[PDB]
Design a protein around this ligand. Structure first.
Ligand SMILES: CCOc1ccc(F)c([C@@H](Nc2ccc3c(N)nccc3c2)C(=O)N2CCC[C@@H]2c2ccccc2)c1
Ligand SMILES: [Ca+2]
Ligand SMILES: [Cl-]
Ligand SMILES: [Cl-]
Ligand SMILES: [Cl-]
Lengths: 58, 250
């Protein structure tokens, strides 16, 4: 996996590393799940999420 | 915004309204509790830097509903490369005097990493632009916050499809050449927000164009990906006396 294709499979941010290595990362207010790709909020009002819609779909 | 719709209250929670002596100046985008991104050109005619107010949680300008939060603008930071009265480098970073309180109605838009924005977000076709600008060319501005979905063009395609400033590497075109749908003057500074896998990001700033939803012309937006490292560095800096700060770019 390389970050230039399909975002390296990362939900958010992607770093290429020496090897066939890739590390996904998350914005502040999120944490990376054990899948190594997904980001889940760690705070009530993470950036880029619309609370009245997140609660509409909870 | 021409040819959009009302943004349902709370669905554009990063939108900022900038006021000068109570009068609508421009939009902006909240990216953290104390930081707002707007357009440099918003500030070309400011005389008293101390009467600039940012409002978060605004929706209907005709009423107070208690979700609004107003703050003084403590710092307006503009890239050294921006020249007043011209189009390039049209970005400003505003430091609020006190943080906003995040609520259902006040939420920052994520400022993406450069690589992510360049490699991924730049290829998401549609993105939302919003503001309280003119609903028509030569028309009244909106009382409720408006929002429009606009498709982004590669600049080579914008130049081909358009028919006067260059579109530089610090800009991108988005919208429609058929005169139906655009952002306009009074939306300047507001967000061009891009969704990717469940989260929204800041990709552009309403910057310039011809007229407003003018046939043959697309909206032009500051390419925020060019400024991520500039912004991040400034957000780690101590405030300096005096509202306006010109900061080296790159
Ligand atoms: C970099 C700004 O450059 C320019 C150039 C021309 C120009 F019309 C604008 C105006 N902004 C926009 C933004 C988006 C537009 C779009 N999507 N479609 C069509 C037109 C649009 C116009 C603007 O702010 N003006 C115009 C009248 C005084 C005021 C001003 C302009 C400059 C400085 C201060 C105030 C900015
Ligand atoms: Ca209101
Ligand atoms: Cl939480
Ligand atoms: Cl410093
Ligand atoms: Cl000052």
């Amino acid at each position: 996996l390389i970050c230039v294709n399909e975002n390296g499979g990362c939900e958010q941010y992607c770093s290429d590393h020496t090897g066939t290595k890739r590390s996904c990362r998350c914005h502040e207010g999120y944490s990376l799940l054990a899948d190594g790709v997904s980001c889940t909020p760690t705070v009530e009002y993470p950036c880029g999420k619309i609370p009245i819609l997140e609660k509409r779909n909870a | 915004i021409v040819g959009g719709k009302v943004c349902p209250k709370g669905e554009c929670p990063w939108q900022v309204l900038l006021l000068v002596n109570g009068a609508q100046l421009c939009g902006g985008t909240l990216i953290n509790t104390i930081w707002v991104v707007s357009a440099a050109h918003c500030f070309d005619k400011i005389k008293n830097w101390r009467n600039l107010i940012a409002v978060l949680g605004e929706h209907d300008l005709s009423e107070h509903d208690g979700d609004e939060q107003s703050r003084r603008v403590a710092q307006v930071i503009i890239p050294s490369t921006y020249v007043p009265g011209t189009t390039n480098h049209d970005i400003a970073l505003l430091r609020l005097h006190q943080p906003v309180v995040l609520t259902d109605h006040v939420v920052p838009l994520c400022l993406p990493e450069r690589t992510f924005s360049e490699r991924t977000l730049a290829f998401v076709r549609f993105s939302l632009v919003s503001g309280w600008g003119q609903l028509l060319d030569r028309g009244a501005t909106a009382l409720e916050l408006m929002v429009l979905n606009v498709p982004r063009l590669m600049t080579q395609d914008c130049l081909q499809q358009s028919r006067s400033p260059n579109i530089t590497e610090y800009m991108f075109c988005a919208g429609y050449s058929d005169g139906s749908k655009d952002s306009c003057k009074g939306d300047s500074g507001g967000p061009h927000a891009t969704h990717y896998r469940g989260t929204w990001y800041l990709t552009g700033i309403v910057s310039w164009g011809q007229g407003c939803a003018t046939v043959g012309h697309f909206g032009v937006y500051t390419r925020v990906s060019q400024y991520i490292e500039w912004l991040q560095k400034l957000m780690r800096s101590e405030p300096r006396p005096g509202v306006l700060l010109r900061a080296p770019f790159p």
